């Protein structure tokens, strides 16, 4: 069968599933950005932009 490192080649001649895989990557990336922002908001201290700005945190 296909080796492990070629499994995604099944999409080369399947535009619909390629779009699906791209959609899922895009879902993952956007989910990352949302999750990351939530974690930051749950840890970020806004009380001192002078000596404790975002880049120190």
């Amino acid at each position: 069968g296909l080796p492990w490192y070629r499994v995604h080649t099944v999409l080369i001649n399947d535009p619909g599933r390629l779009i699906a895989a791209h959609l899922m990557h895009t879902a993952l990336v956007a989910g990352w950005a949302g999750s990351m922002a939530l974690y930051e908001l749950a840890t970020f201290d806004p009380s001192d932009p002078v000596l404790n700005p975002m880049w120190r945190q």
């Binding site: 806004p46 009380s47 001192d48 000596l51």
Partner: protein
């Protein structure tokens, strides 16, 4: 105005507001210093609660900042009464005796910190 009854007021939020006087009332109320006086009703209606921020330095100008009331229309002091003395120098001194002279109040600072206070004029 059409003197309001409880049923006119109930649930409107008017019950937490102090009576007002209109623009014609720029007069002078005479004080006869042989006469004794009283305040029959004193009402205090808060419209803003500011909390002093607690800064890192020390020394800097720490400011009072705005807050959001979260405990609803439950904040006013009313039905307060007491002596109004006329002093030898012609000043007046109000001595609070009794009334609904406190309210617990919770305000919320930006970021979520809740600041409860006993808003009062006791004594």
């Amino acid at each position: 105005a059409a003197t309001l009854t409880y049923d006119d007021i109930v649930g409107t939020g008017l019950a937490n507001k102090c009576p007002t006087l209109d623009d014609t009332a720029r007069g002078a109320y005479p004080i006869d210093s042989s006469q004794t006086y009283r305040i029959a009703r004193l009402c205090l209606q808060p419209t803003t609660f500011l909390v002093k921020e607690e800064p890192k330095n020390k020394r800097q100008e720490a400011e009072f900042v705005p807050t959001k009331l979260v405990t609803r229309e439950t904040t006013s002091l009313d039905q307060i009464q007491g002596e109004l003395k006329v002093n030898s120098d012609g000043s007046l001194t109000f001595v609070e005796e009794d009334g609904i002279d406190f309210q617990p109040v919770t305000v919320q600072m930006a970021g979520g910190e809740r600041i409860p206070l006993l808003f009062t004029v006791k004594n």
